Design a protein around this nucleic acid. Structure first.
Ligand code: DTP
Ligand code: CA
Ligand code: MG
Length: 430
DNA sequence: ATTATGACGCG
DNA sequence: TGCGTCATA
């Protein structure tokens, strides 16, 4: 009743760039614009591995993780842009720098949480309050929401997509109570107006298009964002949740796409997020733990409290290289050469980071994978990062892992290494 | 698929 | 103030 929290206290958006690495390459090379194209990493094995795909190429069935040779079978005219290679490895600097362009624009509107290279959460609660005070009970025009979908609408008593979008928006706006500054639906609507403005600024100032979700928390905002891609935004209201969740596979919700989500499905014998409402909080805690159980109990009702963290910069700076099949490092000299390449890239990125962001990493984390281990990581060890010097970091990394070598011969390495990973962490102000 | 980030548990 | 695992981009 009057004491039941509905999780409508915040306005949260998630902005996610459309096919991000592709847009970065299309900005740089106009010949790629408005074409089926993909970004590929390396070239020797099966034409290279695809890591990003334009919407035109997706129509042919091209996907991330596909080898380029196989993608060409589906889309013979597919254009390809290669990730830069430096010091023997893929180097992602262009995309990291493009990400900074977008994050800096978003930060003008509100505090953001960098969630990945191409997406950020925004807590718009305060910005919405401010905008509502300027509006002064003035209605919100559909013209202020030219790319917004209202999930669940139209409904009740045109066969084209834009027509449906407008119909739903009209129904939503007609029902809005602009009189009440505390109305959560109104708050979301104003949030959506702000997000249109943010998205326009991103496109004007960078050339890049994006999609966004607007809702009352991060999980719903992330879900919302994916409902209408690309180049569109979606408002998921609290009232839209029962219908939305009634046919929503559990795996679609952030954090439930893996083993936990599979366990929810198997243990409870359900398929859709909505079906979770039929269990008590204690029942859910009994299967999935105190924390997960409480989270699921609220989440299936559209309620989540995880804050948008005030963090625009990554907390770690890392680089890594796999050594597949035949290339597994079987000599000490090889292990040392690659550790040096990684350390040189790391030194370059750290030195730039220190100058830009007034901070210094204090810990170096070294991780390896050994041949035969199905685990993505076989071993992790750390040491002090006291100087931004590639030679010192590579030597320190070796020292930390050299004991992993079973080889009797001092020159050889066994068992061969299938991966090396160096990561700088534990930043302190400088 | 390879090269990344970030959270959480304490087999 | 370590390390392994999970989940995601
Ligand atoms: N598994 C991966 N390995 C390497 N790079 C990845 C991987 N997943 C994503 N990326 C990179 C390339 C992407 O352009 C960028 C952002 O990823 P993501 O948001 O998942 O898709 P996207 O931006 O390419 O398309 P979409 O329009 O569907 O968001 O990060
Ligand atoms: Ca994206
Ligand atoms: Mg993304």
């Amino acid at each position: 009743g009057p004491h039941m929290a509905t999780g409508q206290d915040r306005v949260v958006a998630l902005v996610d760039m459309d096919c991000f690495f592709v847009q970065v390459e299309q900005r740089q090379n106009p010949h790629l614009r408005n074409k089926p194209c993909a970004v590929v990493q390396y070239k020797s094995w099966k034409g290279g591995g695809i890591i990003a795909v334009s919407y035109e190429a997706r129509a042919f069935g091209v996907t991330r993780s596909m080898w380029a040779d196989d993608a060409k079978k589906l889309c013979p005219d597919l254009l390809l842009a290669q990730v830069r290679e430096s010091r023997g490895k893929a180097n992602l600097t262009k995309y990291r720098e493009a990400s900074v362009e977008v994050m800096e624009i978003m930060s003008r509107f509100a505090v953001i949480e960098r969630a990945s290279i191409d997406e950020a959460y925004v807590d718009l609660t305060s910005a919405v309050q401010e905008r509502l005070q300027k509006l002064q009970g003035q209605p919100i025009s559909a013209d202020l929401l030219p790319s917004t979908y209202i999930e669940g609408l139209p409904q009740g008593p045109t066969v084209q997509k834009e027509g449906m979008r407008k119909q739903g928006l009209f129904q939503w706006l007609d029902s809005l109570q602009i009189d009440n500054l505390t109305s959560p639906d109104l708050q979301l609507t104003v949030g959506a107006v702000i997000v249109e403005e943010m998205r326009a600024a991103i496109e004007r100032e960078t050339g890049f298009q994006c999609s966004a979700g607007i809702s009352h928390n991060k999980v719903l905002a992330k879900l919302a964002c994916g409902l209408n891609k690309p180049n569109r935004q979606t408002l998921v209201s609290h009232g839209s949740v029962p219908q939305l969740f009634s046919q929503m596979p559990i795996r679609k919700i952030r954090s439930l796409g893996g083993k936990l989500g599979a366990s929810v499905i198997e243990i409870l014998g359900i398929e859709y997020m909505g079906e979770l409402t039929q269990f008590t909080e204690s029942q859910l805690q009994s299967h999935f733990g105190e924390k997960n159980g409480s989270w699921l109990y609220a989440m299936c009702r559209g309620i989540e409290h995880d804050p948008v963290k005030p963090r625009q910069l990554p907390k770690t700076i890392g680089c890594s290289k796999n050594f597949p099949g035949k290339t597994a490092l079987a000599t000490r000299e090889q292990v040392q050469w690659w550790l040096l390449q990684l350390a040189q890239e790391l030194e370059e990125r750290l030195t730039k980071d220190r100058n830009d962001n007034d901070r210094v990493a204090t810990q170096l984390v070294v991780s390896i994978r050994v041949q035969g281990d199905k685990r993505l990581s076989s071993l992790r060890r750390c040491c002090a990062l006291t100087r931004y010097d590639a030679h010192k970091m590579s030597h320190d990394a070796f020292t930390v892992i050299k004991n992993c070598n079973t080889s009797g011969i001092q020159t050889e390495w066994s068992p061969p290494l299938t991966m090396l990973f160096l990561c700088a962490t534990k930043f302190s102000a400088s």
